[PDB]
Amino acid sequence: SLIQFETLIMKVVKKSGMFWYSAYGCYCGWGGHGRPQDATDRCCFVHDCCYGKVTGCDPKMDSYTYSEENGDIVCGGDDPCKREICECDRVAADCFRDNLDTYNSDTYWRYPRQDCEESPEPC
Amino acid sequence: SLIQFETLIMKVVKKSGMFWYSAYGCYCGWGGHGRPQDATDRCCFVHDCCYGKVTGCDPKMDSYTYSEENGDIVCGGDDPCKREICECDRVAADCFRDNLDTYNSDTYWRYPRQDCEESPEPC
Ligand SMILES: [Ca+2]
Numbered sequence: 587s588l589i590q591f592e593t594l595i596m597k598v599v600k601k602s603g604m605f606w607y608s609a610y611g612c613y614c615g616w617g618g619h620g621r622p623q624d625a626t627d628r629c630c631f632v633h634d635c636c637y638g639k640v641t642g643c644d645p646k647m648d649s650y651t652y653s654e655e656n657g658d659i660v661c662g663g664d665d666p667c668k669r670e671i672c673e674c675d676r677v678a679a680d681c682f683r684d685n686l687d688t689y690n691s692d693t694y695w696r697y698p699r700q701d702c703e704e705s706p707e708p709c
Numbered sequence: 710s711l712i713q714f715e716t717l718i719m720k721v722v723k724k725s726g727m728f729w730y731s732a733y734g735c736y737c738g739w740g741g742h743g744r745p746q747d748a749t750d751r752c753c754f755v756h757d758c759c760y761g762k763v764t765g766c767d768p769k770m771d772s773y774t775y776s777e778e779n780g781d782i783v784c785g786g787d788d789p790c791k792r793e794i795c796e797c798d799r800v801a802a803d804c805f806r807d808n809l810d811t812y813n814s815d816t817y818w819r820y821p822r823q824d825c826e827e828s829p830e831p832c
Pocket residue numbers: 613614615616617618630634
């Protein structure tokens with residue numbers, strides 16, 4: 587669930603997802619349209635694409651399981667659908683951490699809407 | 710720290726996953742100027758004032774101590790400066806939660822900046 591996704595960002599990226607990734611670029615935030623503006627923005631585009639390929643459960647409200655093996659996050663596989671949800675959040679959290687080197691809020695925080703008007707890239 | 714502030718929002722508002730406070734009104738988000746547009750927005754104005762009235766520690770990166778006795782967040786530790794930071798966060802979180810009935814993101818999410826170019830009133 588979004589609550590877990592939110593907690594995963596703090597655990598893996600060791601940063602606040604609400605105050606650093608809820609209005610970034612063209613896809614980091616609710617919804618999304620246009621083209622991802624950078625690496626962090628592509629992470630969100632992929633996450634949106636991931637949630638959209640999940641069938642058999644709800645990626646926003648359904649809760650999944652996960653543990654910590656060696657400071658890393660492992661998703662529970664007992665329930666097949668929910669593991670697919672965890673993977674979407676897990677892969678996004680790691681994507682944010684690996685791209686911190688180029689995180690550019692100075693430019694993309696509250697990025698003008700006119701910049702995200704193009705038709706979105708296919709998933 | 711921002712991570713703790715976010716964690717306190719998740720714990721108090723019990724719905725921090727769908728109610729964001731990163732770009733709401735004139736004061737819920739980075740910076741702040743003009744005047745509170747509503748109740749939630751006033752919660753952020755008072756919070757910004759609370760962070761501005763602190764010296765001796767950093768409210769952004771310093772971590773404070775706190776417990777969850779029952780359902781409340783009790784600020785503790787043995788540092789007046791950090792317990793101050795915790796109180797700024799504790800109050801704001803409750804404020805957000807007590808004003809959920811008025812939360813209006815349809816209107817105030819990504820509120821145009823030109824609507825906040827008035828000089829702010831004193832704290
Ligand atoms: Ca999005």
